[PDB]
């Protein structure tokens, strides 16, 4: 037997209810410097979504997928420019830049 662990709740008047028919999957927004580091990560790794998702603890795989698709639909020229230039594969310096961006956003939140 539970000793006052839950609180009563009113839920549904058993009456006409609104037809939502929508599930708004929460998608974390994208920051400017975050978008820049994501673009350089693309340029360094290519179009491998698994590696990008692995090296992105602040984001999800579907989020990276949608961002890449939107950039292709909107900023395909920048995508091609990034795909033209190359840079040595950076897994460690990429983590260092991720920590730097984390500190930058923490500072921006402090302000």
């Amino acid at each position: 037997c539970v000793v006052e662990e839950n609180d009563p709740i009113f839920e549904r008047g058993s009456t006409t209810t609104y037809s939502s028919f929508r599930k708004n999957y929460y998608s974390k927004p994208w920051s400017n410097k975050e978008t820049d580091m994501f673009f350089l990560a693309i340029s360094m790794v290519g179009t491998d979504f698994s590696m990008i998702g692995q090296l992105f603890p602040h984001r999800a795989r579907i989020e990276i997928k949608n961002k890449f698709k939107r950039e292709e639909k909107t900023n395909g020229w920048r995508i091609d420019k990034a795909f033209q230039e190359k840079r040595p594969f950076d897994f460690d310096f990429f983590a260092h830049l991720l920590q730097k961006v984390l500190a930058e956003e923490e500072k921006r939140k402090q302000k």
Partner: protein, 361 residues
Amino acid sequence: RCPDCGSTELVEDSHYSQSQLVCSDCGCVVTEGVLTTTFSDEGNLREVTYSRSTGENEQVSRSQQRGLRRVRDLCRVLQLPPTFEDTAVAYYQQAYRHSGIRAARLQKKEVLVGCCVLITCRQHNWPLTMGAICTLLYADLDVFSSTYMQIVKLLGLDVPSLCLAELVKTYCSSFKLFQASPSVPAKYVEDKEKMLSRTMQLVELANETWLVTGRHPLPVITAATFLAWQSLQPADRLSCSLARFCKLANVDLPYPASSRLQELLAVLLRMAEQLAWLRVLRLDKRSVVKHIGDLLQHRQSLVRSAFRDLLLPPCMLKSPKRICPVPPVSTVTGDENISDSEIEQYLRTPQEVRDFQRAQA
């Protein structure tokens, strides 16, 4: 026909409780007497149906029985007449003839029952939002919509359009503002008939002004009934808001109800600009609600004048100068092979392959 004269003018006439056929030309009877069942016998004998006779009504697996029982209890809890239950079970038995339908998961059968009862209540002009049906189904509305589309694409039955008048008649009565319950101050109470009429006029103004196409009805109906409740006593209600009204009425407010309310207020303002006295008042989005009566009184000429200067989503009304840019014609295909360095850029190098293998080793 007449056996002797050949006249085909045989007429049925009622004699002193005797049914008989007599020719009008020669008055000769061709057939008399009739055999009918008596009540004492009709009460004892049992009627038989074609299905049970041919052996049907026994090929009803556990799943189809569960489905029809679900349909029955669903149409029962809604307090529908027996004709609706009969039509729903008939539509279910008709939809269950497909091989892909019977062979489906519980969610599929449940959403199928929901869509069947929806179609049923739709035909005999009974409005019922899908939300109110999904509220009694142990499933989500996202799969319900997809299955509804799938079945209406397969069955192609008649699907009348949801009437806005009956929808308002059904939805307006759900509000508690009509009675002076202990939880509602007496000031907010209103007459149900006047409120219904005002909301009907408001939604008609919305219907003619392109505010029912594409957008869900419920938010528009809520905005209209809120504006009506406000205009009936602007003194003690203009200070309130849509959220306050919804909380007072104990009704979940639709999310886009705010946008619909704003659009309707803008339409009302544009209409008031034509009326000399209102245009002199120089009203605003808030003070316009009180004059809704005069606007609705002459809504026809007002909306005609407003459309003489249509309604579209605000995203495309930001005065697009370039509407559907023509892409450059580049359907050329080189000779056969434009370049090969592209594959050199798309291939993976040994170092890159090793780095990839090491990343997720």
